[PDB]
Design a protein around this nucleic acid. Structure first.
Ligand SMILES: [Mg+2]
Lengths: 79, 99, 1337
RNA sequence: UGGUAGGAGU
DNA sequence: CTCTGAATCTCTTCCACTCCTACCAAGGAC
DNA sequence: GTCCGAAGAGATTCAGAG
């Protein structure tokens, strides 16, 4: 039941790419088998991703490096 | 009081909005997209323009996605635009979506 | 996939390529049989099958057959959906002209053939014969003759004379004409005409021919030989559900055209006489014209009930067309509508939502949750369970809507805030519960108001609504920095009642431990809410950066203030609560909280304030009664005195001593004075009505009258409303606008007789009609503004430009209208601001001015600061973030991708509903006098008369800004010398406006310039003087000889030789207008500084704003000096007055006309600066732009629009008007072609010419020179590069034809165009996707 | 059904 | 008598959401 | 069994004028 976004906006100043990165992270949670990092309490994926972004453990570069690690794991399983 | 999730559609595949008479959807007027895009809200505008109104393939795909827990969206093309294209082509004026 | 939309005029080969078949039989599907006909408008063979995946015939009806055709049916076996895509064609027996390219203002077919449109109309309808391939015949082929003339010609010439009739002749001429040779011939003619009027429409023909040459289309394609037919499914014969079938009114037109074509074909087969064949051809062409555009030519064909048939063109243009109704106004699923009602229990971010409405809107989510949980195995089971609304469904629903925002909007959506997102809570009932504080932005009134709800489905949409649209985010309006949520009606009344003091009350004199003790005392009833006490208050001030230090002290405050202190956050001081806390005080307190403690404490504080105000207003029990409105005891005496005075004035009028007009004016003045006295007496009796006895002696205090408490707190009412309730209603105007002599003496507390009620109803009805039409006018203006500025989006971050506009406070001869700090707040500087201490800079070059920087600027108090603005932005296709400055909604520089154009247009158009449709100069305060553009001449008396037409009288204070600046007319004497302080209330300048004095340099004899005896000058007798005074005779009044010579006065010495002006060789000359009284006769010695002659001596509403933004030329415009130099008069009053000016360095021949009825005030001898007015009057913005540049016209438009808006009391930031101005002046005309390939007479976009010039300066080639052009908002929107944006706005047919002949290609990249297409808009969250797409290209 | 008006609400 | 100015005519547009209640519309002839 | 106001801008013309 998050009411504000300002605290999460302070992490990503533009507040326009904040929507994009949070949507990407929430899509990762709800479509894939990915489990949230910040503990969940009967909350929608929207607020879960927003709370992760607030804590500073989620960013566009962090998501990019995580995707690179998953790509390396996927190519490793091939051989 | 009135509400609608999915009902009938017209020849232009928009919802008739006969009001409560034929289970119509509230019209998202011209002055409302101005406010929607003044906020900088692009994704909401796209979904309202395509997935909830005219993209029949988009409509069925979105409905199938929602019940499966997914919230994706295929933009597609509105049918009103294709109707306009045919209407203009009917006057001897060549409209083409050149690539 | 696609990236552009292209327009080309379709060739008949293309028409045949589109067609999947042919239409020959006029009959449509049979009424008696469901089967469509063989060759009808609804044909299964040439269009799609009626039943999907099944052929019409049984043998091929099976779904297995793919892409096969029945041999006898001739129908493919694809799905029925292609029936919307398949197109057919009909082959016209005779060529018919396309209506759109005819009967239009451009007259493109007429422009191509260069022969009059009436001639085309005559030829098309078989009236006059036009000749082709004349050959040896004397008459040219372009000329047109009558039928009898054709008979005479054929009896003269047998075969060499070939004249065809109708569209066939036009097509033959179009085929015969060759474009390039005519282009070169017309260019040669243009080189030979040398007259601009002949260049007009000739450049147009040249441009049309060039457009046809460059585009891959041929002129003969304009004449229609093959006519496409709409797909049958688009124009459906929808069943009535009863007897017979509906007609779309389009199938009827197609049937008519097909029938006429078939009859013409039959006539051709039968070889009918030529007259009948020509008549049938005319009928067929008229039918085609009616089908393509009904009512374009002649009268529209009517089906029945005198309703014109809706043709193909009519269903594209207009509000009912596709472009406005369907493309931009798509109806949305997952939406609902219900009445709204107030809910005080809600938090700021929440909103009520009926259980049934929530169940219906969120149905697919409920189905998905049921499938996931496992109660319902299939979708049908889940649907049945939901329809049963079982117990489990509600528990599932509570989970779904737990954190899913819903979008709420009102029917008229003017603000950006007209649609907001809320977190919904399930309630019982059928009404949406809305937060009381939110309703201010929505303009909701809770009187049958309705609001529609929408559900964002996709995850991106949910994040987007939460991040941007949620009500907690919208604290400051985008129009101005003032907060948009504010306690309005009952909360403010409760807070005002709580924070008030009574002279004697229960619990007075107590000393309390803290706010909790005050609450405990008030609750238990031991102390009153207004008792003055001494409470220890813990006050926190953030003296340190990020740290709070507690300060505890005893304070003299009431119990109510102490109780309210509990909800106040930590950061705020105690000084805010201690006052009476009216509406302005509450708004200021909320703004202070927002400034200091951020957003979250502000939201919590707003909720707490609303709850506390509601609770204590309810506990107060404020009520209105007939004893609350007290009538002053002196009202009867004032009325009697006023009636006695008006009777005395009437008696004076009866004797004829005073005229009727002055009697009426005196009566009006007397009644206004009486009304003012009554209102003042009533207010004085009301405000201090309550008298409290405390501790013995009596005492006075502010009254607790409920009506007065409502008025003072700002909750509701005003001074005028109270004046009408308990005082004279005042004089009421007639519908014409005149003031009724007798005012309404009776108030509303007492009765109103019938006559007074009628007089009131006059104005009431006038105001109601005014509002009813204001709504529509403001809506239209807002639509035009939004479309003219749709494309503007903050694209770049910094341009590095140095050009900017100058910000100075506006002084209209009085107090400061706009403080300097208000205009420059939140805007960056173009140049470094100079400290008042010389050689020092206060502000860096590119720093953004904020509250602290403005405050530092306040201490030095420098008037002029250069500020970067939108019009000066050098970035093409968008503005940078620095030029725009603050976002005005958040304390931040504007983000990249913001759609500033739409925000600006909505902010301008929102207050439109409020805007209705229909000496001596003395300074108030002491200061130093500044005088500019002054040529002072002193006489013996010491007065200084200024020679210049325009001169500015300014007052300098100690810190240096011009507190008061007054325009001084030419010839005004001056009291005190410049550069010295003058005491307040002293008339600085004096003059007589009726007679304009004439400056002189030295005393001496006078003889008039170009002296002619008698005619130039003749003495006029005056009774007061007793001796005839010389008066220059008017040019018409005097004879021809005198009028040919210039009427002016030349000073001569006492010896007789002419006096030359000091500092110049030429002899002094002074202007003498026609019929001007001359004080001193010729041959009479004058004094120094004497006058040589005397010369005898607008909407503030919405239409004014519309005119300013449309840049219409005023009915009486002012003329200005195009080029600086010394003025001269080559020829006077010969056809039209001629003016010639020559600059100092090199004389330039100049020609100018001045109308006679317009007075000319510029002196003939004095040099006139460029841009100075020669005739006083309204200034056309085009002249301002052309002479003084873009900055001057920007300043003028901004100042005028702001002055219009200030009168009503609204506040709109200047950045929005600057954005609209930037959108207005986007096109530049080419002064010189230069090396670049731009036509001189052609008009191009300024960004394109800037890019071309930049490329040319990159190389060695010289760039082109351009002159900026100003266009109205309508014209600017219609002249944009892309045809889709112009077509969706206005004049769909004209812009469509213009794009058709020119073959325009639209690159999209706009906001409205991407909305029409259906892609992601370039602004906002779509900016990243669009820039990625641009990079990938 | 669909196109027209007709009245009304904000 | 060309040629800048003034007369005419002529086209286009006049808010945005609902609640509804009706009127309306191709055959007998071959 | 089947068929015939009002407001503005703009284009066109037209009368004056040299
Ligand atoms: Mg209301």
């Amino acid at each position: 039941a998050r009411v504000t976004v300002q605290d999460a906006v302070e992490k990503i100043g533009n507040r326009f790419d904040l929507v994009l990165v949070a949507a990407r992270r929430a899509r990762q949670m709800q479509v894939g088998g990915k489990d949230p990092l910040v503990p969940e309490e009967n909350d929608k994926t929207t607020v879960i991703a927003l709370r992760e972004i607030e804590e500073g453990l989620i960013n566009n570069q962090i998501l990019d490096v995580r995707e690179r690690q998953e790509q390396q794991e996927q190519e490793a399983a091939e051989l | 009081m009135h509400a609608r999730s999915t009902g009938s559609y017209s020849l232009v595949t928009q919802q008739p909005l006969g009001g409560k008479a034929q289970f119509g959807g509230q019209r998202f007027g011209e002055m409302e997209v101005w406010a929607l895009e003044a906020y900088g809200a692009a994704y909401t505008l796209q979904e309202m323009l395509t997935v909830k109104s005219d993209d029949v393939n988009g409509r069925t795909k979105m409905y199938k996605n929602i019940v499966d827990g997914n919230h994706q969206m295929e933009p597609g093309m509105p049918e009103s635009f294709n109707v306009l294209l045919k209407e203009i082509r009917s006057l001897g004026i060549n409209i083409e979506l050149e690539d | 996939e696609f990236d552009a939309i292209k327009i080309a005029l379709a060739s008949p080969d293309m028409i045949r390529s589109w067609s999947f078949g042919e239409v020959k039989k006029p009959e449509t599907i049979n009424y008696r049989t469901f089967k469509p006909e063989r060759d009808g408008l609804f044909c299964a063979r040439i269009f799609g099958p009626v039943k999907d995946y099944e052929c019409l015939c049984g043998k091929y009806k099976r779904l297995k057959h793919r892409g096969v055709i029945c041999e006898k049916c001739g129908v493919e076996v694809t799905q029925t959906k292609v029936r919307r895509e398949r197109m057919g064609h009909i082959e016209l027996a005779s060529p018919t002209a396309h209506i759109w390219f005819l009967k239009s203002l451009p007259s493109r077919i007429g422009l191509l053939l260069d022969m009059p449109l009436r001639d085309i109309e005559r030829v098309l309808y078989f009236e006059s014969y036009v000749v082709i391939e004349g050959g040896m015949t004397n008459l040219e082929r372009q000329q047109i003759l009558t039928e009898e003339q054709y008979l005479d010609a054929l009896e003269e010439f047998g075969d060499e004379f070939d004249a065809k009739m109708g569209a066939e002749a036009i097509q033959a001429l179009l085929k015969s004409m060759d474009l390039e040779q005519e282009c070169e011939q017309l260019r040669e003619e243009l080189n030979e005409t040398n007259s601009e009027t002949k260049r007009k429409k000739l450049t147009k023909r040249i441009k049309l021919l060039e457009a046809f040459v460059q585009s891959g289309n041929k002129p003969e394609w304009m004449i229609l030989t093959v006519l496409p037919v709409l797909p049958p499914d688009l124009r459906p014969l929808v069943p009535l559900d009863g007897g017979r079938f509906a007609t779309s009114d389009l199938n009827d037109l197609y049937r008519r055209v097909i029938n006429r074509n078939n009859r013409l074909k039959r006539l051709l087969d039968l070889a009918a006489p030529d007259i009948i064949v020509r008549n049938e051809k005319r009928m067929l062409q008229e039918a085609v014209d009616a089908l393509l555009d009904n009512g374009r030519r002649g009268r529209a064909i009517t089906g029945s009930n005198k309703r014109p048939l809706k043709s193909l063109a009519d269903m594209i243009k207009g509000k009912q067309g596709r472009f406005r109704q369907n493309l931009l106004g798509k109806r949305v699923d997952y939406s609902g509508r219900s009445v709204i009602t107030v809910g005080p229990y809600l938090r700021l971010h929440q909103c009520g939502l009926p259980k049934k409405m929530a169940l219906e809107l969120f149905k697919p989510f409920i189905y998905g949750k049921l499938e996931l949980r496992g109660l319902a195995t299939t979708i049908k089971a889940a649907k049945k369970m939901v329809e049963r609304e079982e117990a489990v469904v509600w528990d599932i629903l509570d989970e779904v809507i737990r954190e899913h925002p819903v979008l709420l909007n009102r029917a008229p959506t003017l603000h950006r805030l007209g649609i907001q997102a809320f977190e919904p809570v399930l309630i019982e009932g059928k009404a949406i519960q809305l937060h009381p504080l939110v309703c201010a932005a929505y303009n909701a009134d809770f009187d049958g108001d309705q609001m529609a709800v929408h559900v964002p489905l996709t995850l991106e949409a949910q994040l987007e609504a939460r991040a941007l649209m949620m009500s907690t985010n919208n604290i400051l309006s985008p129009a101005n920095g003032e907060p948009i949520i504010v306690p309005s009606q009952d909360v403010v009344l409760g807070l005002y009642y709580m924070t008030r003091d009574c002279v004697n009350a229960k619990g007075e004199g107590m000393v309390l431990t803290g706010p909790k003790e005050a609450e405990r005392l008030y609750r238990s009833g031991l102390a009153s809410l207004h008792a003055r006490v001494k409470v220890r208050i813990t006050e926190y001030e953030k003296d340190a950066n990020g740290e709070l230090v507690a300060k505890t002290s005893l304070k003299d405050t009431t119990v109510g203030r102490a109780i309210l202190w509990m909800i106040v956050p930590k950061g705020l001081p105690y000084s805010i609560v201690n006052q009476a806390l009216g509406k302005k005080a509450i708004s200021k307190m909320l703004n202070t909280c927002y400034r200091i403690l951020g957003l979250k404490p502000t939201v919590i504080f707003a909720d707490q304030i609303m709850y506390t105000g509601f609770a204590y207003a309810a506990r107060s029990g404020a009520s209105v009664g007939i004893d609350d409105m007290v009538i002053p005891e002196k009202k009867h005496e004032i009325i009697s005195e006023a009636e006695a005075e008006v009777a005395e004035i009437q008696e004076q009028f009866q004797s004829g001593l005073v005229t009727a007009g002055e009697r009426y004016n005196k009566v009006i003045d007397i009644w206004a004075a009486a009304n003012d006295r009554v209102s003042k007496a009533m207010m004085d009796n009301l405000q201090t009505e309550t008298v409290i006895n405390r501790d013995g002696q009596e005492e006075k205090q502010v009254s607790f009258n409920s009506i007065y408490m409502m008025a003072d707190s700002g909750a509701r009412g005003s001074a005028a409303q109270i004046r009408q309730l308990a005082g004279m209603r005042g004089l009421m105007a007639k519908p014409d606008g005149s003031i009724i002599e007798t005012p309404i003496t009776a108030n509303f507390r007492e009765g109103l007789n019938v006559l007074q009620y009628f007089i009131s109803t006059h104005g009431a009805r006038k105001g109601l009609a005014d509002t009813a039409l204001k709504t529509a006018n403001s809506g239209y203006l807002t639509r035009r503004l939004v479309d003219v500025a749709q494309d503007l989006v903050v694209t770049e971050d910094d341009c590095g430009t140095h050009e900017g506009i100058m910000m100075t406070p506006v002084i209209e001869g009085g107090d400061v209208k706009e403080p300097l700090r208000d205009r420059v707040l939140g805007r960056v500087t173009a140049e470094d601001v100079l400290k008042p201490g010389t050689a020092d800079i206060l502000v860096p070059r590119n720093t953004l001015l904020h509250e602290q920087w403005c405050d530092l600027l306040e201490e030095n108090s420098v008037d002029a600061v250069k500020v970067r603005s939108v019009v000066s932005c050098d970035t093409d296709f968008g503005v940078c973030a620095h030029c725009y400055g603050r976002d005005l909604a958040r304390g931040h520089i504007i983000n990249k991708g913001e759609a500033i154009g739409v925000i600006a247009a909505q902010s301008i158009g929102e207050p439109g509903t409020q805007l209705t449709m229909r000496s001596s100069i003395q300074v108030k305060n002491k200061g130093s006098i500044k005088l500019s553009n002054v040529k002072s001449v002193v006489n013996s008396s010491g007065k200084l008369v200024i020679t210049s037409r325009n001169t500015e009288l300014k007052l300098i204070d100690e810190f240096g800004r011009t507190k008061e600046s007054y325009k001084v007319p030419y010839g005004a004497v001056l009291a005190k010398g410049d550069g010295e302080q003058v005491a307040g209330g002293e008339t600085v300048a004096n003059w007589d406006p009726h007679t304009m004095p004439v400056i002189t340099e030295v005393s001496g004899f006078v003889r008039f310039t170009d002296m002619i005896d008698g005619q130039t000058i003749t003495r006029q007798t005056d009774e007061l003087t007793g001796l005839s005074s010389l008066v220059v005779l008017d040019s018409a009044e005097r004879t021809a000889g005198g009028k040919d010579l210039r009427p002016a006065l030349k000073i001569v010495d006492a010896q007789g030789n002419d006096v030359l002006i000091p500092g110049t060789d030429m002899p002094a000359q002074y202007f003498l207008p026609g019929k001007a009284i001359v004080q001193l006769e010729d041959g009479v010695q004058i004094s120094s500084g004497d006058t040589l002659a005397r010369i005898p001596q607008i909407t503030g509403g919405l239409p004014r704003v519309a005119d300013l933004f449309e840049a219409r030329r005023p009915k009486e415009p002012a003329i200005l000096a195009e080029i600086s130099g010394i003025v001269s008069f080559g020829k006077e009053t010969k056809g039209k007055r001629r003016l010639v000016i020559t600059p100092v360095d090199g004389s330039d021949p100049y020609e100018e006309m001045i109308p006679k009825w317009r007075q000319l005030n510029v002196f003939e001898g004095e040099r006139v600066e460029r841009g100075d007015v020669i005739s006083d009057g309204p200034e056309a913005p085009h002249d301002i732009l052309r002479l003084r540049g873009v900055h001057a016209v920007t300043r003028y438009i901004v100042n005028e629009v702001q002055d219009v808006y200030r009168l009503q009391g609204v506040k709109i930031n200047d950045k929005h008007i600057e954005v609209i101005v930037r959108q207005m002046l986007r096109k530049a005309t080419i002064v010189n072609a230069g090396s670049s390939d731009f036509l001189e007479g052609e008009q191009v976009e300024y960004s394109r010419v800037k890019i071309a010039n930049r490329e040319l300066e990159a190389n060695g080639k010289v760039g082109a020179t351009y002159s900026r052009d100003l266009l109205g908002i309508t014209k600017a929107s219609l002249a944009t590069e892309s045809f889709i944006s112009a077509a969706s706005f206005q004049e769909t047919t004209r812009v469509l034809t213009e794009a058709a002949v020119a073959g325009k290609r639209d690159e999209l990249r706009g906001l409205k165009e991407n909305v029409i297409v259906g892609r992601l808009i370039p602004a906002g969250t779509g900016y990243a996707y669009h820039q990625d797409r641009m990079r990938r290209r």
